[PDB]
Amino acid sequence: APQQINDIVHRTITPLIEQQKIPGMAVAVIYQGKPYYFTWGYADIAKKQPVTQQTLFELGSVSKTFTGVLGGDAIARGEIKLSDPTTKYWPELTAKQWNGITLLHLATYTAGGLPLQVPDEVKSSSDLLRFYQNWQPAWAPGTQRLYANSSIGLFGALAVKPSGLSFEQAMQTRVFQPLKLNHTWINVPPAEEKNYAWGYREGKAVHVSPGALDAEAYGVKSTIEDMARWVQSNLKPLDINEKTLQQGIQLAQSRYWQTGDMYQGLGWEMLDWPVNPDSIINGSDNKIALAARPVKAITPPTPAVRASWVHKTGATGGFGSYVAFIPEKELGIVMLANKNYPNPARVDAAWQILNALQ
Ligand SMILES: *C(=O)N1C[C@H](NOS(=O)(=O)O)CC[C@H]1C(N)=O
Ligand SMILES: [Cl-]
Ligand SMILES: [Zn+2]
Ligand SMILES: [Zn+2]
């Protein structure tokens, strides 16, 4: 890697690891469109297995970027429209509060206060129907953004229904395979478990537990190499030869809602570049990111703006991830760690690196 990249990565990430007690970390810096990889520490502390470029990390809510793009691909196939009512795809959702709630609202957390999590008691399809049937919105649809796995999770599950495929099969064949993300998994196969890092929470080794709509909202695992390729794909959608996937990537970076200086895409979130670093750093704190905030609709949605900071945070019990990229500059970063450490520290480090290389 260029000396400037090696230097800023050492000076930024090694102290981050020191400050946050991260056991293992992988970083990809995409500079002039090319990834440069960095690893530290251990995927499995007790076995002393190092992090490598083949180590699988839990992406947590970064998974939503895949869901958003798969939904975009379905839009480009004509299979769904974001204006479609939820009930078009789930007619058994008969309760009246669902009148007026569209796929757009589900995808962008604006349905009116769907909760952050699907309750852990939801174990069956009938449990899931009961949950959504009995949910009472706090707000009218399209007025407040409240980040919610139960919102985009349902979007993902319904967006694939016209295809006749399961969510996992649709994702495999429509996103992972065309992009040659061959070490990216919703369910890690047995032959790949040797690569699956342990997450660490209070010193204990942990993996994310199964939950309703987990694949859609927080359940993807991937390597630093595949995540760099995902960033490249989102930086350069015209290099994707499958037209519906090219367009799906572009649609996931359209701007559907604005609140403050932030814009909601499908999975991805965006700000105009150059960005105020304190905005993205402070806005990543859970106390803000997960708070209800009024939104202004953008109609029509702004087509993907190249001069944007595009990004997504994610966490599981034992992992912390961050992705950010700037299409205009063909610059990006992926940060995968097997400890969940505070978002603002991740975003700060990412902006120190990309700011240095712009
Ligand atoms: C995604 O990682 N999840 C949903 C929500 N995301 O907010 S974050 O991206 O700013 O970390 C909270 C964390 C996590 C979860 N526990 O479901
Ligand atoms: Cl130093
Ligand atoms: Zn040093
Ligand atoms: Zn392999």
Curated annotation (Swiss-Prot):
Assigned GO CC terms: outer membrane-bounded periplasmic space
Name of the protein described by the UniProt record: Beta-lactamase
Catalytic residues as annotated in Swiss-Prot or TrEMBL: 61
PANTHER family found in the cross-reference section: BETA-LACTAMASE-RELATED, D-ALANYL-D-ALANINE-CARBOXYPEPTIDASE/ENDOPEPTIDASE AMPH
Keyword tags: Antibiotic resistance, Hydrolase, Periplasm, Signal
GO molecular function: beta-lactamase activity
Subunit-level organization: Monomer.
Localization of this protein: Periplasm
Principal subcellular localisation of the protein: periplasm
Keyword Hydrolase applies: yes
Function in brief: Class C beta-lactamase which confers resistance to penicillins and cephalosporins. Has benzylpenicillin- and cephaloridine-hydrolyzing activity. Has weak cefuroxime, cefotaxime, cefoxitin and oxacillin-hydrolyzing activities.
Organism of derivation: Escherichia coli (strain K12)
Residues noted as binding a beta-lactam in the record, renumbered to the chain: 61, 117, 147, 149, 315, 340
